[PDB]
Design a protein around this ligand. Structure first.
Ligand SMILES: *[C@](O)(C(=O)NCCc1ccccc1)[C@H](C[C@@H]1CCNC1=O)NC(=O)[C@@H]1CCCN1C(=O)COc1ccc(Cl)cc1Cl
Ligand SMILES: *[C@](O)(C(=O)NCCc1ccccc1)[C@H](C[C@@H]1CCNC1=O)NC(=O)[C@@H]1CCCN1C(=O)COc1ccc(Cl)cc1Cl
Ligand SMILES: [Cl-]
Ligand SMILES: [Cl-]
Ligand code: NA
Lengths: 305, 306
């Protein structure tokens, strides 16, 4: 028993992290097959960052402008091209530690593991959720750009996030591995802000199921509700709408515990309207929304990679 | 910026995890050089778990009664020995993925990363703290015994925990890698219970410093306290005593933020008295005690957000 915020084992990704330097700028890259992926803002000066023309800055550059270091070995760059906000550096050596992998774009509410890296060296791993406002609540310092986020399914790594920037409120923003930003952000030193965030309702419900599985049941009650009435409560409290698809996804947990989703929604309704009355759930005084239903089922069943 | 419960990258430990089977019992082992370390209760059967005589059970086993599987490869056991509550199986192959490592026995309040493994396959990684009552608050299911806890400061893996059991309150207990239990616990199914736990005061102070580093000052106050008055109050909230060693350890964070340690103690006193009045600190509505001062320096910027 027990329930903890758990990251995937990071070994398969650690063997792909490298250091990329262009001019005075150093950050992290992801070395898969014979390509190194990194943020296209590695080619910029601070002057350029104020208003960069990446097209023009890149055509100006050549292969020899890029220093790629894998541990203590230099990788020779033999080609370069841009895809959206990601730079692709073709190298002369395929990474022998390349795992089975895909590039995937995740949806708000989905979680993933972040491998925080500095100078090509992994430093820490933690779990994040793509927020509804397309930020993540990460922990990133200067030099962390190019750190990646991922999920693992059996032996296949699904890369979903590459880190690019921090916003004034201390949250973080990045791209998928095809260089498309999550959220209405751009890779420029300019005025940008996180939008008002909301709470991921289906994930709070999943975590209430995790709590019941772990013996924490004080918030269960005799009442049930409907999707329509609950969604009016959700809107009042800046919770995301609950869809029928969300209800279907939670179906397993409902069966195991004997609390119908709409039964649990009646529990959540009362918690929103009345608070916790000094009590905790799974050790928390806040309603947790960074566990997906799959995260709960996978942790409560001991799935292995 | 940001502040998260951050584990060490687990790859160096993943390459050491194996599956050990004896009889009908399967659990995880740790393969370092030519030795596999695992909980000695892998040699026990149903009847044996109340009062096992491990010396008598082990003498009856041959090297070939132990099946060790590294991925898809069976490792040949060529010797065995028991050290406290750990079984050491000598195998004929040294692990080519063995990292630089050491064994360290940690003190209550220290943190480490846990690599949860089932059938020698890693499932996830998370941070834990050794509680004052010598338990950890983990996430461990049947089959997780032999999973290990570690730190990786400066590229060397310090193994500090091997998982053996779950107590009735849902918390967890195990040994160092020399097989000595943390706390008064034994590898028997007789009745055992964790003592009353307390909050790790020096870690709550470290986390309040992390909050200041990251730009939050709302909980500070104009007051100070003596160390003895602080401990008289804090113990009324089931907080561990703060020692002069703890004050010294907090020195670097005090220097970076400009807040004297005993001034932060006065902030903590007020927070215990008042609660947070609907506010949060680093995203939490409770006072967090599973970050050490070292953890804060590891993760946080060296420049305070003033
Ligand atoms: C990322 O670029 C980085 O790690 N850079 C190292 C190399 C580099 C790149 C470009 C130009 C010069 C040098 C950083 C990572 C940020 C920094 C702090 N935390 C992070 O996650 N990203 C940035 O610096 C980006 C790029 C332009 C603007 N930007 C921001 O993050 C904007 O916000 C900040 C920047 C720096 C700090 Cl200390 C704080 C903030 Cl809010
Ligand atoms: C650990 O030994 C294990 O993973 N067992 C699998 C191999 C094995 C060896 C010998 C005998 C039986 C099985 C488990 C891990 C526990 C189980 C649930 N979560 C955990 O962390 N440890 C034990 O079962 C130990 C051994 C003696 C008693 N014990 C306990 O954990 C006592 O409490 C429990 C046992 C089992 C369950 Cl499902 C729940 C509890 Cl609270
Ligand atoms: Cl210690
Ligand atoms: Cl909380
Ligand atoms: Na109900």
């Amino acid at each position: 028993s027990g329930f903890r915020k758990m990251a995937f084992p990071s070994g398969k990704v650690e063997g792909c992290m490298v250091q990329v330097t262009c001019g005075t700028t150093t950050l992290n890259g992801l070395w898969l097959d014979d390509v190194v992926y990194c943020p296209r803002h590695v080619i910029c000066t601070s002057e350029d960052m104020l208003n960069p023309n990446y097209e023009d800055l890149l055509i100006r550059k050549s292969n020899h402008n890029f220093l790629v270091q894998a541990g203590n070995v230099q990788l020779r760059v033999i080609g370069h091209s841009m895809q959206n906000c990601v730079l692709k550096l073709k190298v002369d050596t395929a990474n022998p530690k390349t795992p089975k992998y895909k590039f995937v774009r995740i949806q708000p509410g989905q979680t993933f593991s972040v491998l925080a890296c500095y100078n090509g060296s992994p430093s820490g791993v933690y779990q994040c959720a793509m927020r509804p406002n397309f930020t993540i609540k990460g922990s990133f310092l200067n030099g962390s750009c190019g750190s990646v986020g991922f999920n693992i399914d059996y032996d296949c790594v699904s890369f979903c996030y590459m880190h690019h920037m921090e916003l004034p409120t201390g949250v973080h923003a990045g791209t998928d591995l095809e260089g498309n930003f999550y959220g209405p952000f751009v890779d420029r030193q300019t005025a940008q802000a996180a939008g008002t965030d909301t709470t991921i309702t289906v994930n709070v419900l999943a975590w209430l199921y995790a709590a019941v599985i772990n013996g924490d049941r004080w918030f269960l009650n005799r009442f049930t509700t409907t999707l329509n009435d609950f969604n009016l409560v959700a809107m009042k409290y800046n919770y995301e709408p609950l869809t029928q698809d969300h209800v279907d996804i939670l179906g397993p947990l409902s069966a195991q515990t004997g609390i119908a989703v709409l039964d649990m929604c009646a529990s959540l309704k009362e918690l929103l309207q009345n608070g916790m009355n000094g009590r905790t759930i799974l050790g928390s005084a806040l309603l947790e929304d960074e566990f997906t239903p799959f995260d709960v089922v996978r942790q409560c069943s001991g799935v292995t990679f």
